[PDB]
Design a protein around this nucleic acid. Structure first.
Ligand SMILES: Nc1ccn([C@@H]2O[C@H](COP(=O)(O)O)[C@@H](O)[C@H]2O)c(=O)n1
Ligand SMILES: [Mg+2]
Ligand SMILES: [Mg+2]
Ligand SMILES: [Mg+2]
Ligand SMILES: [Mg+2]
Ligand SMILES: [Mg+2]
Ligand SMILES: [Mg+2]
Ligand SMILES: [Mg+2]
Ligand SMILES: [Mg+2]
Ligand SMILES: [Mg+2]
Ligand SMILES: [Mg+2]
Ligand SMILES: [Mg+2]
Ligand SMILES: [Mg+2]
Ligand SMILES: [Mg+2]
Ligand SMILES: [Mg+2]
Ligand SMILES: [Mg+2]
Ligand SMILES: [Mg+2]
Ligand SMILES: [Mg+2]
Ligand SMILES: [Mg+2]
Ligand SMILES: [Mg+2]
Ligand SMILES: [Mg+2]
Ligand SMILES: [Mg+2]
Ligand SMILES: [Mg+2]
Ligand SMILES: [Mg+2]
Ligand SMILES: [Mg+2]
Ligand SMILES: [Mg+2]
Ligand SMILES: [Mg+2]
Ligand SMILES: [Mg+2]
Ligand SMILES: [Mg+2]
Ligand SMILES: [Mg+2]
Ligand SMILES: [Mg+2]
Ligand SMILES: [Mg+2]
Ligand SMILES: [Mg+2]
Ligand SMILES: [Mg+2]
Ligand SMILES: [Mg+2]
Ligand SMILES: [Mg+2]
Ligand SMILES: [Mg+2]
Lengths: 46, 95, 217, 243
RNA sequence: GCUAAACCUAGCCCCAAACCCCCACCUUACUACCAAACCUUAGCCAAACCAUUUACCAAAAUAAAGUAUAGGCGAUAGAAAUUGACUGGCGCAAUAGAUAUAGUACCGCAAGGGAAAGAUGAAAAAACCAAGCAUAAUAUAGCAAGGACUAACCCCUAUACCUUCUGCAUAAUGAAUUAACUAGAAAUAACUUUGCAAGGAGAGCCAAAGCUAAGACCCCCGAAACCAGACGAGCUACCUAAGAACAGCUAAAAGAGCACACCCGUCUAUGUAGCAAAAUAGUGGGAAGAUUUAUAGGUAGAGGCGACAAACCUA
RNA sequence: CCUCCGCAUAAGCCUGCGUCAGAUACUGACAAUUAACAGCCCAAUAUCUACAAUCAACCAACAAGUCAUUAUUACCCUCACUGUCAACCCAACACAGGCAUGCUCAUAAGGAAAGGUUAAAAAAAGUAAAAGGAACUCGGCAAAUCUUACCCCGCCUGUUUACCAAAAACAUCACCUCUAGCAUCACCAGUAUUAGAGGCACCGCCUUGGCUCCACGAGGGUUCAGCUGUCUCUUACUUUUAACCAGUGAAAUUGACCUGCCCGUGAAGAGGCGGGCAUAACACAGCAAGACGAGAAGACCCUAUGGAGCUUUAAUUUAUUAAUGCAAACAGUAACCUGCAUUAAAAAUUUCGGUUGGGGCGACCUCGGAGCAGAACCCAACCUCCGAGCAGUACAUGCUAAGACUUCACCAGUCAAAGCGAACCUCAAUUGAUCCA
């Protein structure tokens, strides 16, 4: 049907999927944070 | 042909050329005849001798081999007992 | 995935345990077995399969009284809640044990083949030759793993000096030690295999969905 | 820009500036030494020069070592310098054919060893090369005391080494008394590998353990300035009483 | 005469030197307080295919030397022994120089992508011209001009440019127009001009007039791909856990009938830069089930998942 | 005059139409949502719990089900923290869409289809229509009034290509066949009446089945009846659109244009070229013949030593797994791990020549004699014809070396005096480089 809205927000899913705790759990996520830190990003995670 | 190596920045020789041809110092290159030791049973004696000769190369073949080697192979070498020391220089070549 | 298996319970409880479905999926989270998912929600009755398990600081052959024969959703037979001594437990009920019968669990190897009823359980030395038995264990004490499905009965064909030969319901033969315990008689829910499933709905209630791409190749 | 120092030299700069500088001298000597192992999976050229074939001229030969791979189970045991060879191979011993991955592993045993210096039976994961090196060393105690750090190539093996070396350096009551003549026999049998205790405590450590051991040495819960200043004042008043 | 146009320092680039950095916060980070690291890169790419092979990257001046050596002995690859190693700018100047006024605003679920722009001056406690228009619409006839003419038109001549083509006015491509920015990088050997000359060159090299030095010569944009490592199952597929919904009539526990709520999407009509990157309006199919549905969780890329449609896995 | 609307919670937003001041729901300043609702829980050791729910009462099942504490030990200090606004969220937008649950069943709540005219066409929607009643059409599509029967397929209810296919396809009960004798991370807390895999299609009778065979279908056709603007053949009105006035105000497109018709010509279909003819200049509304109109570097066809698949009885490999064998590491008595081989499986890498009156099919691919090509040399063909991939004789069928020829390049090919050594080659093509071996 009308296919604009794949973003159905919930803060539990947002925090569980892209959060700081999850980023820091994986060693590849620690490198994601390290990359945002080097880029200079004002927000490193959700 | 590797005009600029990744290692030195220098120009490289084609060792296929060095395996096959002889550069005499005057700019002449001397080769063998392609086929000179195969099927000699079925070749005739005159064709066999024509195959046995050492021949000179063409002008554009000479210039190609000039390009495909470096100038180490174009210096003047004074080997002890050399069968080509008389051939390394041009005599009476008017024009 | 975060797959703790639901079967973490240690003490033998008689009450049903809330049984988690799996969808045919590993701990890795991926499908391992195809065609599984979404049955009626069930509960697991913890069956004691060691038929001769005498209770705490007690003796050999003992008696139990059947309390209730019951449908079990987690298998094909019927489960008998039986009570003996100060404890009670579930067992697989052979056919024609109602509520009120009395069954015997003996480890005694009588020299003569014991004249025993259809419900009770003895070792194959006490069982006669050519005898219909169901809950059969390979080594003594491990607990029965063989014939215990609905309506199946394996026969005892012969007795040998230290072993015995069982015809398993697949027309198979199996060597068992003489001393292991086995229950006589055929299991309940006979006519079970002559139940037509009827609707794809009935299959989907049993917990088997249609699944395609069964060969992840 | 450019770094003042090269990046392969950054580690030495740390070892000169830190608490790594307050590590003792002999330990940093070993860490900087880091020599070459013994040939295990390659056959060394016996000579420095060789008349190579196809032209009778002597070319210099160096023997280059195979990049061997050691797993943490190896460090939990003892493998005699022997490890996995992770390489490629040609399909049918013919270069004009497929090239294809290959991992050569050693054969691993669970052997039980008595060490006369510690008086304990250890069960370890050895291989035939360790067994043969023990036979040519005339015992496990001699093998571990004689073999070098990287030829031994085990964190466990060097723990065994510094336990044995500390045992020797302190001359401990190792089995128990009523056999001091037998203990004297043991320490006389291995008397040759005797080093100071201040060295044997640092034998065999990793750098992480060495830094941890060093900061444990220099913790030193602070001195109250009440104590410091009353010491100064007492000194000054004794000076005034003298004058 | 409007719109504009103009500006110069904010900074940046390449070198040299010198080795540099109170509280809260891994739980849903920024939240006062409870029982485990270590495993060959692969592949694009050259070989005008590709299958052994294919530079360097994993600290190493000049020369030896692109030599020995390796090699579908081919593309190419390639040593060693030995040997002489105080700050500046023929840099940018706001589309440049950094992406930077900022990793911000904005975009994306996320990894991630990623901007733009300011100019009065000593003190503000003080002038002209791009395009586009306007002042000022047009008068037969035609690549818009040219020859001219007393005179704008009238007369005569006259098939836009680029590119690609055997041949384009072509009804072949490109292009509204303006400003700015935007595309020829080097060796072997020659030749020319100096220096010196049987020797040249500030050694490691050449030399049967040579040798040394200089000068001259090698473009830009564009795939579908491939491999590695991350990020994604808030959409959708399936599953798990604990929830909920299903009027009325007929019927009397049936994947029941008619039919709402809801779910779907048969036919038509509208719509098409739309209300909408799939909607609307009527018509329709299911609507107590193999149903629909909220919330949380799981499966991840040659992988998942599938009641197979090469379907779906954030248009 | 309108409305499956409205109010509330949940989820999501995060101050987003409160007051004042200012400029042209914007900007700034100032205010505000007050816990009783809701959230943030539980001191444990051992242990107890066979009994559904459905008005739960008879009674009815099958698919077999959620609600539960005790003996003792320690524990009186008491009510903090946080959410609380709105016209709101997800769709780039103040978006006709998406959006869970409770309650109201037309509202007590919420809202406004028309900026103002006029009343052309074309277009949209609606209503009415004489006579006739499917003559329309691919077809009764749409409308109008409701209905009948027959076939084809699929047994059924279900599922499917989100966004052109909802079907005869997929699934499904039923049946067959194949594999499996067993324990704890799937199958499974299972055990041959079980589990896993594949296939066919319900059923009554009989043994790639076959003949019947009932019900169902937004499937595919056919018939009757009615009904109707589908049509003969169109019409009238009303609403939107429209046109005009006012405000706001895009987009594709565009070499430049001072932008006519006819006949001819020309890269073969001319506004612009030749010959004629026409010809004051500017709007507005229509229209759709042309501008080979716009859109989107044609998806059809071919090409590329471009890419990706897909299958194999294509090439190369078994590195990985498997089951053997051989050693290696133990127990002996007169299994598991490692190394080397093999055959399988899964794969994994890689490629898929050329000419061709498009490409494919078919045929050819090197060399020589003849004709086209008549008299130096040359001269094409998917042009016309004929042949070869050797055979003989001896084995000077040695060795050297002036000078030449040359298949239009190179590679290759050919002749040859003299000289030394000697007996005293025939040949129409009659073939193949380099590296390796
Ligand atoms: N001298 C030779 C000739 C053939 N061969 C081998 O024989 C093979 C013969 O090729 P096919 O059988 O056509 C070559 O590929 C090569 O492996 C060789 O090794 N040495
Ligand atoms: Mg290539
Ligand atoms: Mg800039
Ligand atoms: Mg920029
Ligand atoms: Mg102007
Ligand atoms: Mg053309
Ligand atoms: Mg073209
Ligand atoms: Mg254009
Ligand atoms: Mg310009
Ligand atoms: Mg989900
Ligand atoms: Mg129904
Ligand atoms: Mg249809
Ligand atoms: Mg599905
Ligand atoms: Mg298909
Ligand atoms: Mg298909
Ligand atoms: Mg949108
Ligand atoms: Mg109201
Ligand atoms: Mg209006
Ligand atoms: Mg009528
Ligand atoms: Mg007709
Ligand atoms: Mg008709
Ligand atoms: Mg209709
Ligand atoms: Mg059907
Ligand atoms: Mg579709
Ligand atoms: Mg759908
Ligand atoms: Mg459809
Ligand atoms: Mg249907
Ligand atoms: Mg207007
Ligand atoms: Mg014409
Ligand atoms: Mg034109
Ligand atoms: Mg067109
Ligand atoms: Mg094209
Ligand atoms: Mg080509
Ligand atoms: Mg490729
Ligand atoms: Mg691929
Ligand atoms: Mg072709
Ligand atoms: Mg020639």
């Amino acid at each position: 049907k009308a296919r604009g809205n794949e973003y159905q927000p919930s803060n539990i899913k947002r925090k569980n999927k892209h959060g700081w705790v999850r980023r820091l759990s994986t060693p590849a996520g620690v490198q994601v944070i390290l990359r945002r830190m080097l880029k200079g990003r004002k927000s490193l995670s959700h | 042909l590797t005009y600029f190596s990744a290692r030195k920045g220098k120009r490289k020789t084609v060792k296929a050329v060095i395996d096959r041809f002889l550069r005499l110092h005057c700019g002449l290159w001397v080769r063998r005849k392609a086929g000179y030791k195969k099927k000699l049973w079925k070749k005739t004696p005159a064709r066999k001798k024509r195959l046995r000769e050492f021949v000179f190369c063409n002008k554009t073949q000479s210039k190609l081999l000039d390009k495909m080697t470096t100038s180490f192979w174009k210096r003047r070498n004074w080997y002890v007992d050399d069968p080509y020391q008389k051939y390394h220089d041009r005599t009476n070549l008017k024009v | 995935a975060n797959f703790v298996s639901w079967k973490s319970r240690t003490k033998y409880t008689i009450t049903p345990v809330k049984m988690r479905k799996s969808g045919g999926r590993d701990h890795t989270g991926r499908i391992r077995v195809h065609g599984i998912g979404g049955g009626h929600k069930q509960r697991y009755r913890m069956i004691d399969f060691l038929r001769f398990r005498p209770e705490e600081t007690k003796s050999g052959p003992f008696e139990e009284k059947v309390i209730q024969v019951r449908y079990d959703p987690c298998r094909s037979a019927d489960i008998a809640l039986v009570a003996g001594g100060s404890r009670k437990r579930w067992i697989i009920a052979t056919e024609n044990m109602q509520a009120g019968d009395t069954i015997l669990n003996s480890n005694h190897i009588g020299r003569m083949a014991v004249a025993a009823r259809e419900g009770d359980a003895h070792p194959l030395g006490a069982l006669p030759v050519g005898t219909l038995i169901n809950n059969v264990e390979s080594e003594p004490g491990r607990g029965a793993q063989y014939i215990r499905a609905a309506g199946t009965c394996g026969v005892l064909l012969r007795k040998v000096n230290g072993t015995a030969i069982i015809q398993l319901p697949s027309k198979r033969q199996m060597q068992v030690l003489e001393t292991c315990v086995a229950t006589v008689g055929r299991v309940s829910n006979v006519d079970h295999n002559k139940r037509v499933i009827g609707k794809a709905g009935r299959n989907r209630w049993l917990g088997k969905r249609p699944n395609s791409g069964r060969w992840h190749r | 820009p450019l770094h003042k120092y090269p990046v392969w030299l950054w580690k030495r700069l740390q070892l000169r500036e830190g608490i790594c500088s307050r590590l003792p001298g002999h330990y940093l000597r070993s860490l900087e030494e880091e020599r070459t192992p013994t040939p295990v999976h390659y056959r060394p050229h016996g000579a420095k020069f060789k008349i190579n074939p196809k032209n009778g001229q002597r070319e210099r030969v160096e023997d280059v070592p195979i990049p061997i791979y050691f797993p943490p189970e190896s460090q939990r045991g003892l493998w005699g310098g022997e490890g996995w060879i992770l390489g490629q191979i040609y399909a049918n011993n013919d270069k004009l054919s497929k090239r294809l991955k290959k991992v050569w592993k050693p054969q691993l045993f669970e052997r039980e060893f008595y060490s006369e210096i510690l008086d304990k039976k250890f069960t370890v994961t050895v291989t035939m090369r360790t067994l043969d090196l023990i036979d040519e060393a005339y015992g496990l105690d001699f093998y571990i005391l004689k073999a070098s750090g990287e030829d031994l190539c085990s964190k466990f093996g060097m723990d065994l080494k510094r336990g044995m070396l500390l045992r020797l350096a302190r001359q401990d009551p190792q089995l128990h008394p009523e056999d001091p003549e037998r203990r004297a026999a043991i320490y006389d049998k291995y008397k040759e590998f005797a080093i100071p205790e201040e060295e044997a405590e640092w034998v065999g450590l990793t750098l992480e353990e060495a830094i941890e051991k060093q900061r444990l040495l220099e913790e030193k819960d602070p001195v109250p300035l009440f104590k410091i200043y009353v010491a100064e004042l007492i000194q000054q008043l004794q000076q005034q009483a003298l004058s």
